[PDB]
Design a protein around this ligand. Structure first.
Ligand SMILES: [Zn+2]
Ligand SMILES: [Zn+2]
Ligand SMILES: [Zn+2]
Length: 240
C-alpha cells in the first residue's frame, strides 16, 4: 500500500526518522511562514526519497473571499506552494476550497462554478509543473457542492476524501455519498464525532472497516497527531 504520514515542514526533523522506520511516504504541509526558506526545501528533497505529496497552505485562505487582499494572498500561497511542491518532486498537492464553515447546501452549490473558475490559474500551474492537484473536502455541507467543480475541470482536478471533516463539519456524515466522487487520495484518522481529533484509526466512531477496504490500493495519508504505527497496523490488518 501507498501509506503516507502527514506532517508540517516545520516538524520535518521529527518526522523523517519515523518515516524511514515504518516505510511510510510523506505528505508535507507547507507552513506559510517557511515558504521562503530555500534551505529547508533542499534539505528535505535530498534526504527523503519515499513517495511525497504536499498539503498547500489553507489557514484563512479563500479564492472567493469578500476581502480582495485575502483573494490575492490565497492565489499567491497556492501558486508558490505548487512551485515548492514541484521542487520537492511531489506527485500530488492537496488544498481546501476556502468555503467558510456553516454555509447551507444551496449556498455551497452557488460557490461551485465561481470556484471552478477561480481555480483555473492554479490547475494550469499544476499542469505546467506536472503536479496533480487535489481538492479536499473541508466545510462543504455535501458532495453535491464539489461534484460540479470536479466535473468542470474534466479530470484535471482530483478529489481527496477526509471522512472526519464530513462527520464533524458537514451535513453529510455518511462516507458513502463522498466516496461516490471517486477520491484518489484519502485523509485517514478517527474522531469522536464531535471534533476533528486526528486520532489513530480504530480509536473513534468512523468505522473504517465498513467502508475503507475497497480503497486500499489508493494513496492513504495518515493525518494523525500521535505515533502512526497503530494506524499502519490497522491498515495492514485490513489488507490481509
Ligand atoms: Zn486538509
Ligand atoms: Zn484532511
Ligand atoms: Zn483534518
Amino acid at each position: 500500500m501507498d501509506v503516507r504520514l502527514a506532517f508540517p515542514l516545520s516538524r520535518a526533523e521529527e518526522a523523517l526518522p519515523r518515516l524511514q522506520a515504518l516505510g511510510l511516504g510523506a505528505e508535507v504541509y507547507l507552513d506559510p511562514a517557511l515558504l521562503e526558506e530555500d534551505a529547508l526545501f533542499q534539505s528535505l528533497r535530498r534526504r527523503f526519497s519515499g513517495k511525497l505529496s504536499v498539503h498547500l497552505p489553507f489557514w484563512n485562505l479563500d479564492l472567493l473571499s469578500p476581502d480582495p487582499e485575502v483573494r490575492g494572498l490565497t492565489l499567491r500561497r497556492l501558486l508558490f506552494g505548487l512551485d515548492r511542491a514541484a521542487e520537492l518532486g511531489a506527485d500530488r498537492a492537496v488544498f481546501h476550497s476556502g468555503i467558510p464553515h456553516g454555509r447551507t447546501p444551496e449556498e455551497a452549490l452557488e460557490r461551485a462554478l465561481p470556484l471552478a473558475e477561480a481555480l483555473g490559474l492554479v490547475v494550469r500551474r499544476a499542469r505546467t509543473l506536472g503536479v496533480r492537484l487535489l481538492l479536499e473536502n473541508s466545510h462543504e455541507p455535501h458532495p453535491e457542492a464539489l461534484r460540479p467543480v470536479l466535473e468542470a475541470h474534466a479530470g484535471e482536478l482530483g478529489f481527496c476524501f477526509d471522512a472526519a471533516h464530513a462527520r464533524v463539519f458537514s451535513r453529510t456524515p455518511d462516507p458513502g455519498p463522498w466516496l461516490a466522487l471517486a477520491p484518489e487520495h484519502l485523509h485517514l484518522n478517527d474522531t469522536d464525532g464531535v471534533y476533528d481529533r486526528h486520532w489513530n484509526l480504530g480509536r473513534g466512531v468512523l468505522g473504517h472497516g465498513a467502508w475503507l477496504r475497497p480503497y486500499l490500493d489508493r494513496t492513504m495519508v495518515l493525518e494523525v497527531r500521535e505515533d502512526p504505527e497503530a494506524s499502519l497496523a490497522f491498515l495492514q490488518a485490513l489488507a490481509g
